[PDB]
Amino acid sequence: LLQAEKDRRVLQMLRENLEEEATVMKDVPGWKVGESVFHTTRWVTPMMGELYGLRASEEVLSATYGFIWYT
Amino acid sequence: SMVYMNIMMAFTVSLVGLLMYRSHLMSSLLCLEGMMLSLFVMAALTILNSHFTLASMMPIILLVFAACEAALGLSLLVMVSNTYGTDYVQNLNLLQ
Amino acid sequence: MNLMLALLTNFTLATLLVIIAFWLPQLNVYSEKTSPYECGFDPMGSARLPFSMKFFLVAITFLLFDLEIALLLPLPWASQTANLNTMLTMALFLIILLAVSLAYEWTQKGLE
Amino acid sequence: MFMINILMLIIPILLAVAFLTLVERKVLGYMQLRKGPNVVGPYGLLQPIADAIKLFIKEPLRPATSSASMFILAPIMALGLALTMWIPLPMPYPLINMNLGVLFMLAMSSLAVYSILWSGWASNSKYALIGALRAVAQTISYEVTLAIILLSVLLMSGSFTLSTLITTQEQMWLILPAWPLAMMWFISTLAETNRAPFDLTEGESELVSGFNVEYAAGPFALFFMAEYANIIMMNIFTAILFLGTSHNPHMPELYTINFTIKSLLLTMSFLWIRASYPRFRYDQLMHLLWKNFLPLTLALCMWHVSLPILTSGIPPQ
Amino acid sequence: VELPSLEDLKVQEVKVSSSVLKAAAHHYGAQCDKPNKEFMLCRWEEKDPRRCLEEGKLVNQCALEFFRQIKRHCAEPFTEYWTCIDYSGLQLFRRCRKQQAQFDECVLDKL
Amino acid sequence: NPIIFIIILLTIMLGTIIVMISSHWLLVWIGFEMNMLAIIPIMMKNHNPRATEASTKYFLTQSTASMLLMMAVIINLMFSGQWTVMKLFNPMASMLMTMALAMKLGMAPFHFWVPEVTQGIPLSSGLILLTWQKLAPMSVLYQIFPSINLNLILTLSVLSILIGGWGGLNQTQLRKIMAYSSIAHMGWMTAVLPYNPTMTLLNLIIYIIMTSTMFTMFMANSTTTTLSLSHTWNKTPIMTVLILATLLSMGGLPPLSGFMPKWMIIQEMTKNNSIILPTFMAITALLNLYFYMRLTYSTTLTMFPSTNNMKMKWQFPLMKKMTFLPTMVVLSTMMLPLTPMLSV
Amino acid sequence: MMLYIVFILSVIFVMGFVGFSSKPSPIYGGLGLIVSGGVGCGIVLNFGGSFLGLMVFLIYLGGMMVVFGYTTAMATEQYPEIWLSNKAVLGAFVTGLLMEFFMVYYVLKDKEVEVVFEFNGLGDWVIYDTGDSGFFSEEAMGIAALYSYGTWLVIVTGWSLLIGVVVIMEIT
Amino acid sequence: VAAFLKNVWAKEPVLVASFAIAGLAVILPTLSPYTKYSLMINRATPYNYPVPLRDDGNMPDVPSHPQDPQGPSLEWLKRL
Amino acid sequence: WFEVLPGIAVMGVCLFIPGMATARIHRFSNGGKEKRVAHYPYQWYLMERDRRVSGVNRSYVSKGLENID
Amino acid sequence: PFFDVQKRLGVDLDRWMTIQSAEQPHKIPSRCHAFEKEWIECAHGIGSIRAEKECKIEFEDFRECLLRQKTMKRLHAIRRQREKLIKEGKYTPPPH
Numbered sequence A: 001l002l003q004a005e006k007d008r009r010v011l012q013m014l015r016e017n018l019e020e021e022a023t024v025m026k027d028v029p030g031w032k033v034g035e036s037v038f039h040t041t042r043w044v045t046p047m048m049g050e051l052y053g054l055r056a057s058e059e060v061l062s063a064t065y066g067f068i069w070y071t
Numbered sequence B: 001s002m003v004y005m006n007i008m009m010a011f012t013v014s015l016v017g018l019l020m021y022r023s024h025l026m027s028s029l030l031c032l033e034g035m036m037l038s039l040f041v042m043a044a045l046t047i048l049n050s051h052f053t054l055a056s057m058m059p060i061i062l063l064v065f066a067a068c069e070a071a072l073g074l075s076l077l078v079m080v081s082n083t084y085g086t087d088y089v090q091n092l093n094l095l096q
Numbered sequence C: 001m002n003l004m005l006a007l008l009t010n011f012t013l014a015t016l017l018v019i020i021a022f023w024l025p026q027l028n029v030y031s032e033k034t035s036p037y038e039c040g041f042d043p044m045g046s047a048r049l050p051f052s053m054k055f056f057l058v059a060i061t062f063l064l065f066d067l068e069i070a071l072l073l074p075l076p077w078a079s080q081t082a083n084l085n086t087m088l089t090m091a092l093f094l095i096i097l098l099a100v101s102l103a104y105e106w107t108q109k110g111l112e
Numbered sequence D: 001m002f003m004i005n006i007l008m009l010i011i012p013i014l015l016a017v018a019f020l021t022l023v024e025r026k027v028l029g030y031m032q033l034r035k036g037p038n039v040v041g042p043y044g045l046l047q048p049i050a051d052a053i054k055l056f057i058k059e060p061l062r063p064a065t066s067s068a069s070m071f072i073l074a075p076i077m078a079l080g081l082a083l084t085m086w087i088p089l090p091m092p093y094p095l096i097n098m099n100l101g102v103l104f105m106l107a108m109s110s111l112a113v114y115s116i117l118w119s120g121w122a123s124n125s126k127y128a129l130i131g132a133l134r135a136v137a138q139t140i141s142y143e144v145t146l147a148i149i150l151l152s153v154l155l156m157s158g159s160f161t162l163s164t165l166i167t168t169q170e171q172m173w174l175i176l177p178a179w180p181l182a183m184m185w186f187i188s189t190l191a192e193t194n195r196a197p198f199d200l201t202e203g204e205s206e207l208v209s210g211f212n213v214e215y216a217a218g219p220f221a222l223f224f225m226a227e228y229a230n231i232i233m234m235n236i237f238t239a240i241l242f243l244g245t246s247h248n249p250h251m252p253e254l255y256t257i258n259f260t261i262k263s264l265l266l267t268m269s270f271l272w273i274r275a276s277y278p279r280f281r282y283d284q285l286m287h288l289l290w291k292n293f294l295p296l297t298l299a300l301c302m303w304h305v306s307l308p309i310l311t312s313g314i315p316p317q
Numbered sequence E: 001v002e003l004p005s006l007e008d009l010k011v012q013e014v015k016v017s018s019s020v021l022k023a024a025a026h027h028y029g030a031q032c033d034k035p036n037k038e039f040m041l042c043r044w045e046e047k048d049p050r051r052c053l054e055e056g057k058l059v060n061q062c063a064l065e066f067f068r069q070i071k072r073h074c075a076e077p078f079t080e081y082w083t084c085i086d087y088s089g090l091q092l093f094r095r096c097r098k099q100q101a102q103f104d105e106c107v108l109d110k111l
Numbered sequence F: 001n002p003i004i005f006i007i008i009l010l011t012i013m014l015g016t017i018i019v020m021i022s023s024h025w026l027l028v029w030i031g032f033e034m035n036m037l038a039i040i041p042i043m044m045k046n047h048n049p050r051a052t053e054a055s056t057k058y059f060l061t062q063s064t065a066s067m068l069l070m071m072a073v074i075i076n077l078m079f080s081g082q083w084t085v086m087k088l089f090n091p092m093a094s095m096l097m098t099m100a101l102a103m104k105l106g107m108a109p110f111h112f113w114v115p116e117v118t119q120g121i122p123l124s125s126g127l128i129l130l131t132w133q134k135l136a137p138m139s140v141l142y143q144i145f146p147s148i149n150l151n152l153i154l155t156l157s158v159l160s161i162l163i164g165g166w167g168g169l170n171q172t173q174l175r176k177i178m179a180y181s182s183i184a185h186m187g188w189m190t191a192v193l194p195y196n197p198t199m200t201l202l203n204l205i206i207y208i209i210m211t212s213t214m215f216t217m218f219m220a221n222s223t224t225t226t227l228s229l230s231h232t233w234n235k236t237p238i239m240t241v242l243i244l245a246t247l248l249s250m251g252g253l254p255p256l257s258g259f260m261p262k263w264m265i266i267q268e269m270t271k272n273n274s275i276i277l278p279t280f281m282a283i284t285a286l287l288n289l290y291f292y293m294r295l296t297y298s299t300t301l302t303m304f305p306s307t308n309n310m311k312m313k314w315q316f317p318l319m320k321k322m323t324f325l326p327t328m329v330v331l332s333t334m335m336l337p338l339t340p341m342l343s344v
Numbered sequence G: 001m002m003l004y005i006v007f008i009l010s011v012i013f014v015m016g017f018v019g020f021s022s023k024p025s026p027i028y029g030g031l032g033l034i035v036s037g038g039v040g041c042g043i044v045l046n047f048g049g050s051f052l053g054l055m056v057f058l059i060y061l062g063g064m065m066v067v068f069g070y071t072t073a074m075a076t077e078q079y080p081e082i083w084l085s086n087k088a089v090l091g092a093f094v095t096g097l098l099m100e101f102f103m104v105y106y107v108l109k110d111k112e113v114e115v116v117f118e119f120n121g122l123g124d125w126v127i128y129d130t131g132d133s134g135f136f137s138e139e140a141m142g143i144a145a146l147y148s149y150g151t152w153l154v155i156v157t158g159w160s161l162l163i164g165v166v167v168i169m170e171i172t
Numbered sequence H: 001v002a003a004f005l006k007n008v009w010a011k012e013p014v015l016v017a018s019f020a021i022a023g024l025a026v027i028l029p030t031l032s033p034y035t036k037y038s039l040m041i042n043r044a045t046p047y048n049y050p051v052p053l054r055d056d057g058n059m060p061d062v063p064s065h066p067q068d069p070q071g072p073s074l075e076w077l078k079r080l
Numbered sequence I: 001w002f003e004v005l006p007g008i009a010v011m012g013v014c015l016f017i018p019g020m021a022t023a024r025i026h027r028f029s030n031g032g033k034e035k036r037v038a039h040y041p042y043q044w045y046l047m048e049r050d051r052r053v054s055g056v057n058r059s060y061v062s063k064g065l066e067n068i069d
Numbered sequence J: 001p002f003f004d005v006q007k008r009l010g011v012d013l014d015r016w017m018t019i020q021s022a023e024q025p026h027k028i029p030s031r032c033h034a035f036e037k038e039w040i041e042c043a044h045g046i047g048s049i050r051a052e053k054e055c056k057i058e059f060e061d062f063r064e065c066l067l068r069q070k071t072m073k074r075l076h077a078i079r080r081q082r083e084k085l086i087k088e089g090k091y092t093p094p095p096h
């Protein structure tokens, strides 16, 4: 259950970080939406920059550096 | 990221002009032991984020020889001062 | 984020009290005879620091006994394990490998 | 209000090193059949607040033949690590929950000798030049007498944290299953932290104690101060390790009451040893580490490796 | 890549705390056993957790009824059970060992 | 002292086995780490203040030459993370690899490792033990071989005999004359290594034999070239005939068997349409022969045995494995149709 | 407190080396290592592995840095001096000191300048880049130190040190 | 030789106590049957998660219900 | 044997302060409960989950069975 | 030369600690465990001289799994896609 409540978080995180990226700029020297960096179409794990993009204000620091330097 | 450029810039604490020169040879053996932690750290940043789970015993073993290595090199640097009293790398007698 | 503000308090309280003793209440411009005195309760020591062999071997010997306690350090973490005949018989090796290095050197120490 | 907790721990412990200097001599006085500080107190109790202000009035000279940036940097590192070591220490709750902090004690107890190597060098000549070189030499050799038999109980504790070191002793008072190790645990800290029978650091008739020999009462006031901060800290570290008290979560008040009473008792012994025994004459000091202390410590080390296995009593972690 | 919509999200989420989740927690997993063990085969035996979203709700929906049963039948010894174990520090199980049978006086019997 | 002299001497060759028996860059780091730990006592034995001021010039040259190797490992740790001993997957790593290891074998740059050590060690007795340290890194360049830049390995090798040749015509001290032409015989084998890396080992096994038998001849008294005069008519005139035969063999003359490598090694260097490369080196080792002629013009022409001193007694040194060295180091040129099918 | 607490440590560590890489009179050479050794341990005490960082105090900074200062008295005992009070020390201090800022100056302070100097950017929170979390085993980094599988490793390094004493039981 | 274990214990009883603890430490794991329970306890402590298997023909044992009499004997510890 | 007991009783109290102070900060800053410790990264995952769902921004307030009914 | 004793007689002197996907003492893989096992599957009986120019797909993504070179560039350029238009609207997304 704790697994099945965690994977639902990142798909919400991927959807909002893409849908509020696809409405940002649609340039002809720009990106396609729905692509991947890799050739292989298989579900690799995401990255910190995938989940938490260019925002990086407060809560992203507590996500990375939370377990380190204290409870 | 930039956490590797610093520190790969810090690997240039060899720099060979100051790896045997100038005199007070203790200043040169200094950066020979200080060239470690530019290898002990540069390994430790790579084994740890990419969870290898097994190669992290290698940074423990990286100190164990280089301590015993430099301890041997420090034994001989007493022997150059046991015969003189000063190390002074501009001592040279056996030509080449 | 207090580890790291758990010690920078402790060092800025440390460097506070030393400069309110070495500096401030100090400044000895009056008579303050700093002449040739203050020589550590003695006179002029025209000799330099001489080499002492029996106080060098104490440095190196410790260093080679200091390394293989860090090999010996993850013994409590080597308890909750798999195959343990290996774990016991290898743990006993290093201690004997430390013990022989005594007994060879033990036939010549010197007045340490 | 985390910042109000740190100041609530540095300040109430500077009294307990100032109100130990007074009990340094009252206890040492009734052994000689004589009263304590009799006239100024009334009972003595107001002596150290008068005996502190005199030092900071009296002129703090620097020696003319001394160096500059080294001589006034070692008392910075003196009180730094003498007070930083009090952090990860449970009573019953520590200020900091380190995952592995037993090793952090040796990460703090190792660098204290790197100030004696400074101050003996930083000021001046032979009464602290060579006379402090042979004080670094004794303190380095009593880590391998220390670090081994510190590890020799961790095979029975289970891990490196200190909360397990109170959990494993709820029914034992662990001085009984390891009482040979508990002997050499004492004499190590009795000689590492530079005390009365194995002395040459402070100095009786040795280097006429040439590790202070030069500090006037400005910078000297901490050296003594800082140093007395180690001796009540190895006592607060022995009594959380061997002679462990009982913790109750519903009543944390009764922990400390039954706890501070015990570290005080071991602290008496550092006073009660000094009024009996003479010195050790530097050879015989180190002649009993290698030849005599050390081979037993490996012997019990191999004993404490096999005995958790051949009892099928592995500690859980 | 292609993702499912904003729908097939936003399900009835179990909004409880950590200790009350760890309160029962032991009677929980050992008696449902149809949606959750099969969900592991839906995750281990085939990867890509973007295909496997049905049984992520099968484990969740039955867990909604597990706490809904315990509220109606017997919640008076339950709320005091995770009260004492929430008196914190590592959440030990040997402190409230005395008060564990007053919760389980009827969990074996009533329901 | 006697038993511990073996245990030091035994672990020297145990250090170099782990260099060869390894599938893992960490173990080849340990392998010739402890060789640099277990040579330093052999430098010392009689404690003379040149020897202490020679091993310390030996030491830190093989500390850095150690240290750059571990730098070369951790670079391609980042790239693909495989640690088998194979191609290094990065031109910034392999460049830092080959010209780090060129100090232990010393090539023409990284120069004075070779004369400044071997001269004036009072242990001239041997110091045949400087054939293991030519043998450990060659066992590393057999695997790394299909990843090099092909210019650096030749430019260290074209300079090798052009400067190992010129360096010793200006000498008398026959340890330096043995220290020189030891860079030259490291020039012939690594000029070939990109092209068919076996028929390199043929040159090495020959080089161990002909050099080991040179030092054993030298262990009667011989120190200097003027001392190489005064033993023809004094010690044994058969020694003068023997010391002629090996030098004329080691120069590469086709009636003897030091011409066995070149004759075969040009069969590989051309067949690869590279002709101006061997014609430079083959004419370069010609003034590598003017060491040996003008050395043979000392002992074999009775040049002034003066200062009458009689050795009316016999000789009892240990010339171990000497009776079989100038019978495979001279007469083997007919008997090797395939030595390069045993070693291949 | 910032996201840039790792990058702000390492510049000190780079400047720790340039402290003793030039020529400081080998008693301030100790004040180049202990500074760098702690600051370098400030990097390693992130990322999860704390046991591997705390050992760098005990065995390097606790062991070798006493003996490196337990000498420089029994040898090299001339009349001491300080660095930067001479002309040969300060002339090399500034030489990398610009590049210690100049490398930082355009690696990413421009937008993307231009092709070769923009592949590696500063920040942001992808320096750690370890999401998501793990399990109750260890960090790990915790179940890594093994008297399991590696036995050939330990039987060398145990035995390599045993000849380490016998080489130094002689000449001295 | 039987006096040598009594005429050095009148001179240096320091290292004699070390060998007495060095010995009788290697010897005992080959003796008591308490060991190999030290490996038996240490084998059935679950760290990771038990992934299930699939029915395909066999069906060897252990059906979908865990509290059935299905698995091996690790329940002697609760009686211990 | 008398006057030495006031000398003890000033030192002995001076270590009763920091034990009682820290034990009544963690119990007071988090509202009459002990402070959550987290040695393993799994144990952090419960708190950082609980902060997202407890009431506002805290790991020290409870939700209860009656929350979801 | 590479004698390879440890292939004749079946002891592993090392071997285990060599690649990123070998044993994992309690079975915790790396971040690119899926591409190690896939790429080693490519070149097994292949003699590695044709593997450099034939396989070439299962290696390149694995290099880009490990450093994330273009993934960080496609991310960095989105900071220049927007974020000159800070003042030209499109906050996107509003919190949360």
Ligand SMILES: CCCCCCCCCCCCCCCCCC(=O)OC[C@H](COP(=O)(O)OCCN)OC(=O)CCCCCCCCCCCCCCCCC
Pocket (backbone or CB within 6 Å): A067, A068, A069, A070, A071, C003, C004, C007, C011, C015, D076, D097, D098, D099, D100, G034, G035, G037, G038, G039, G041, G042, G045, G046, G050, G054, I038, I039, I040
């Ligand atoms: C003269 C005045 C000028 C000098 C002023 C500066 C002097 C400072 C000297 C202080 C030296 C102390 C260094 C000690 C380092 C050891 C710290 C440590 O290890 O903390 C333990 C902890 C380990 O992590 P863990 O236990 O797993 O946390 C629990 C997670 N559940 O780790 C943690 O909790 C968090 C780890 C990250 C915390 C930040 C990094 C700590 C180090 C910061 C200072 C850098 C060191 C400065 C150089 C030292 C010089 C001596």
Ligand SMILES: CCCCCCCCCCCCCCCCCC(=O)OC[C@H](COP(=O)(O)OCCN)OC(=O)CCCCCCCCCCCCCCCCC
Pocket (backbone or CB within 6 Å): D180, D181, D182, D183, D184, D186, D187, D197, D273, D277, D288, D292, D293, D296, H014, H017, H020, H021, H024
């Ligand atoms: C088979 C089953 C298993 C068997 C298990 C058996 C267990 C046995 C346990 C034995 C090991 C523990 C004992 C530790 C050894 C004692 C240390 C030692 O060896 O000291 C020897 C020292 C040397 O001197 P000596 O040999 O006597 O020669 C001079 C005679 N003219 O001579 C000395 O005596 C020196 C005395 C100590 C020196 C310091 C004294 C200063 C004051 C210290 C007082 C400490 C009091 C107690 C400490 C606190 C205790 C809580």
